[PDB]
Enzyme design. Structure first.
Site, PDB file in Angstrom:
ATOM      1  N   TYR A 157       0.820  -1.193   0.000  1.00 55.72           N
ATOM      2  CA  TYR A 157       0.000   0.000   0.000  1.00 55.72           C
ATOM      3  C   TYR A 157       0.868   1.263   0.000  1.00 55.72           C
ATOM      4  O   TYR A 157       1.657   1.492   0.921  1.00 55.72           O
ATOM      5  CB  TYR A 157      -0.934  -0.019   1.208  1.00 55.72           C
ATOM      6  CG  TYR A 157      -1.935   1.096   1.202  1.00 55.72           C
ATOM      7  CD1 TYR A 157      -2.822   1.251   0.146  1.00 55.72           C
ATOM      8  CD2 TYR A 157      -2.004   1.989   2.252  1.00 55.72           C
ATOM      9  CE1 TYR A 157      -3.743   2.270   0.136  1.00 55.72           C
ATOM     10  CE2 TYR A 157      -2.920   3.007   2.256  1.00 55.72           C
ATOM     11  CZ  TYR A 157      -3.787   3.147   1.199  1.00 55.72           C
ATOM     12  OH  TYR A 157      -4.704   4.167   1.205  1.00 55.72           O
ATOM     13  N   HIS A 207       8.039 -13.335  -9.658  1.00 53.56           N
ATOM     14  CA  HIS A 207       9.038 -12.431 -10.193  1.00 53.56           C
ATOM     15  C   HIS A 207      10.366 -12.560  -9.463  1.00 53.56           C
ATOM     16  O   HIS A 207      10.982 -11.556  -9.132  1.00 53.56           O
ATOM     17  CB  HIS A 207       8.536 -10.982 -10.117  1.00 53.56           C
ATOM     18  CG  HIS A 207       9.036 -10.110 -11.229  1.00 53.56           C
ATOM     19  ND1 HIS A 207      10.309  -9.583 -11.247  1.00 53.56           N
ATOM     20  CD2 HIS A 207       8.434  -9.679 -12.363  1.00 53.56           C
ATOM     21  CE1 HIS A 207      10.469  -8.862 -12.343  1.00 53.56           C
ATOM     22  NE2 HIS A 207       9.345  -8.903 -13.037  1.00 53.56           N
TER      23      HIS A 207
END
Ligand SMILES: [Mg+2]
Ligand SMILES: [Mg+2]
Ligand SMILES: [Mg+2]
Lengths: 399, 390
Positions: A157, A207
Site C-alpha cells: 500500500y 518475479h
C-alpha cells in the site's frame, strides 16, 4: 521463388507509451520489406548499435530466403554469443526475414509453419493494484470483456511496506519485504477465491523475489488456491531447487522469461521442472529458435506461454499469436491493452475478442511500424529504478 | 578509509596492433583512478555504448568501496542479464574498482585477496604453422626462452559453395594427430604440449579424437566441444584419461556449474571479462577448488595488458591456478599500456606496486582509434556449406 537480396537494414526505437520499443526493418532489392521486434527495453541504444554497426554489414547482399543459414551464421558471428543485446538484435532481423518469406508466399506467417492447430489462442491480462478493492475493480472489467484468466498482483500500500525493519541509513534502492509480500499474496488468493469462486483462472508472478526456502513454503501454501500457474518462483540460476517443489506439491509452475542461453532451459525441461515455458521470443533470438524450443517442450509435455509484456512491439505480439495458433502445445497469450499512441505507431494491432487473440490473416506478420508516427515518439532515457531491488538489510535481490 | 565517490567513467577503444582493445576508466573524488579490461574485440562499440549510455549514469556518485554491492547491483540492473556485451561492460568497471581499492590500500592487487600461494605462475605460448618444420622453428625459439609448455597447431565441396571460411574436420583431425606424433618423436617430453580444438568437431568425432590423442599425453586438449554439448563429455571421461580444458566461451554460470560439479573438465578456461570480472572470477576459482578443477584463464591477444596483469594477480593468489597463456605484445601495445610484464624463463610474476600495476596512457591510445574488422573466420563452414561453431 527467386533469390531475395537484402539491400538495407534499419533499427528504430519508439516510445508511444510507457516503454522504449525497438523495431528492425529489412529492405530487399525487390521492394519486399520485413519488420521484426528487437525489444530489450532497458538497453535500447545497445541493441540499435548492435544492429547498425555489426549486423547490417554482414547482411547486405545476402539471400534473405535462407533464414536458417542466416540465423546460424548471425548467432556465432561475434564468436562470443548468447546474450540479451546480441539475441534481440538477431531477433529483429530473423522476424523481418520470416515476414518477408510470408509476404513472398502470399500467406499469413503461421501458414508457413504448417497452419493452425487451434482456432485462436486464449488470453490473460494484468490486474495489479495496491489494495484488494483496486484488484476487484480491475477484475470486474476484465470479466465483462470476456477474460477467463487474470494475472493478479497485490503490491504494498503506497509502495512502502509496513513498518519496514530496516537499518539506520539504508543504501538507496527499491526496498521490499519478502515475508509481507508472501502474506499479501496468500491473502490475495484467499480473498479472490472467496469472492469469485472458480469464475476465472488466477495467475501470479513471484518475479524471482524469494529465496529458495521461501519459494518452497510458498508453493505449498498457495497450492490450495489452485493458481493457473505461479511464475518465476525462482531466479534462472536456482532452478535445481524446483525438484524439492515438484516432489511435494502439485502447484503449476511457469518460468523462463529471463532466459537467453539454452543451458538455462535444457535441463529444466528435460526434467519436467516446469509446466509452462515463459521465454521472451526476442531474448532467445527470434522465430527460428522459438519453433525449435516449442518442439522440445512438446517432447517433454511442457506447454508454452511466451512472455508478452507491455515492453514489446505489437509486431512481437502478432508474431507470438502466429506461433500460438500453430504450435500444438501453446497454452495462453499474455496481453496488456495498447494505448492510442501505440496503435497509431503500429497500425492493425490485434486486441483480444471475448478472451481470445486471433492470428492475422493477411500476407506476412500482418503488423508493421508507421515510421512517420514513430518519429513523433522518440526514445527517452529511463532509469528503471525498480531493478535496484533491496531487502531490508540493504542487500540486492534479483528484481 | 572514507567513502570513495565515483566522479566520472570513460570507455576507450584502441587498436595499437591487431585487435580492438577496450578499457574502462573510473575516476574518483579522491583523485584515485582505476583501470579495467572490457575487451569483447568483435563488438567494441556495443560495449562502449553499454558503458557510456547505461552503466555510467548508475555509477556516478556511488561509493566505490563496496565492490560487492556494486557488482550485484550492476548484474541485474537491466533485468535481463548475462551475455558478452553486458558482462564485459561490467567487468571493466569491476576491475577498475578493485584497482582503486588496491591503490587506496597501498598494496598489489593480489595482496588484497589474501596474498600469494605460489611464487609465480608458469606460462605457455603459441606455436602455430601450416607445416611441421614451421612449428619446429617456433618451438625451438620458445624452448630457448625457457618455456616448458607450448600450444601447438598445424577439398570436396559443392558446385557453388556459399561464401565462407571453409575447413574439413577429418583432415584437421588426421593432421593434428600427426602433429602430436611427430612432436613426441622429435622432442620426447622436453615440453608439455597443448592443443586447442576450438569447437570444430561433432560429438562423435570429439570422442574418437580424444581416444586417439590420449597416448601423446597432451597437457590439455582445449574446447573439444562447444559449450552447448558438454554433456557429451561423460562418454569421454568414462573411457579416456585425456586432460581437458574448456570454457573461454562462457558468459552464463549455467554453462559451467554442472560441468564442474560433475568433474567433466580438468582446467577451466573462462575469459575473466566475459564472466563479469574479478568479483565473479574469485568465486569461480573457489568453486573449482571444491571440485578439484584447476584454472587456466583465457589470455588471448584480444585482451588488454591490464586484463593480463589482473589474471597474473589472480594466478598467484588462487591456490588451484595452473598456468597462464601468453602472447607477446608489440611496441605500440607496450606504448599504450606501460609496464606490462613479460615472462621470465617461462614464468609470469605479479606486479608488486599498488593496484593492478598497469594503466592506459590515454594520450597514446588516441593514436590508435577503433577500426572495424569483419572477422570473416567466424563464418566457418563445412564442405556442404553448413555453418559450424567457429
Ligand atoms: Mg513475469
Ligand atoms: Mg499523423
Ligand atoms: Mg582457445
Amino acid at each position: 521463388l527467386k533469390e531475395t537480396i537484402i539491400s538495407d537494414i534499419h533499427c528504430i526505437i519508439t516510445k508511444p507509451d510507457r516503454h522504449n520499443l525497438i523495431t528492425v526493418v529489412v529492405e530487399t532489392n525487390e521492394g519486399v520489406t520485413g519488420f521484426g521486434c528487437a525489444t530489450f527495453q532497458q538497453r535500447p541504444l545497445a541493441v540499435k548499435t548492435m544492429v547498425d554497426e555489426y549486423l547490417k554489414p554482414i547482411l547486405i547482399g545476402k539471400n534473405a530466403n535462407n533464414i536458417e543459414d542466416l540465423w546460424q551464421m548471425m548467432m556465432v558471428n561475434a564468436y562470443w554469443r548468447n546474450g540479451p543485446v546480441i539475441n534481440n538484435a538477431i531477433s529483429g532481423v530473423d522476424m523481418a526475414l520470416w515476414d518477408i518469406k510470408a509476404k513472398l508466399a502470399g500467406m499469413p506467417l503461421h501458414q508457413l509453419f504448417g497452419g493452425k492447430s487451434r482456432d485462436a489462442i486464449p488470453v490473460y491480462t494484468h490486474a495489479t493494484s495496491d489494495t484488494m478493492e483496486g484488484i476487484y475493480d480491475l477484475v470486474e472489467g476484465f470479466l465483462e470483456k470476456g477474460y477467463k484468466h487474470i494475472r493478479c498482483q497485490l503490491g504494498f500500500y503506497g509502495g512502502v511496506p509496513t513498518d519496514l525493519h530496516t537499518t539506520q541509513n539504508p543504501t538507496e534502492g527499491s526496498y521490499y519485504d519478502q515475508d509481507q509480500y508472501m502474506d499479501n499474496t496468500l491473502t490475495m488468493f484467499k480473498s479472490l477465491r472467496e469472492k469469485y469462486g472458480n469464475q476465472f483462472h488466477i495467475l501470479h508472478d513471484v518475479h524471482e523475489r524469494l529465496f529458495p526456502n521461501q519459494a518452497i513454503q510458498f508453493a505449498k501454501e498457495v497450492e490450495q488456491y489452485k493458481p493457473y500457474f505461479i511464475e518465476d518462483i525462482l531466479p534462472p540460476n536456482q532452478t535445481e531447487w524446483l525438484d524439492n517443489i515438484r516432489s511435494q506439491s502439485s502447484v503449476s509452475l511457469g518460468l523462463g522469461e529471463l532466459f537467453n542461453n539454452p543451458e538455462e532451459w535444457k535441463s529444466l525441461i528435460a526434467n519436467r521442472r516446469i509446466d509452462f515455458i515463459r521465454c521472451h521470443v526476442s531474448q532467445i533470438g527470434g522465430i527460428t529458435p522459438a519453433l525449435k524450443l516449442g518442439h522440445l517442450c512438446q517432447n517433454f509435455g511442457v506447454r508454452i506461454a511466451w512472455h508478452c509484456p507491455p515492453d514489446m512491439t505489437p509486431i512481437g505480439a502478432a508474431v507470438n499469436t502466429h506461433l500460438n495458433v500453430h504450435l500444438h502445445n501453446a497454452a495462453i497469450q499474455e496481453h496488456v491493452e495498447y494505448n492510442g499512441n501505440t496503435h497509431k505507431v503500429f497500425p492493425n494491432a490485434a486486441e483480444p475478442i471475448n478472451g481470445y487473440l486471433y492470428a492475422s490473416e493477411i500476407a506476412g506478420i500482418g503488423v508493421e511500424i508507421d515510421r512517420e508516427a514513430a518519429a513523433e515518439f522518440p526514445v527517452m532515457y529511463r532509469p528503471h529504478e525498480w531493478t535496484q531491488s533491496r531487502l531490508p538489510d540493504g542487500a540486492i535481490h534479483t528484481p
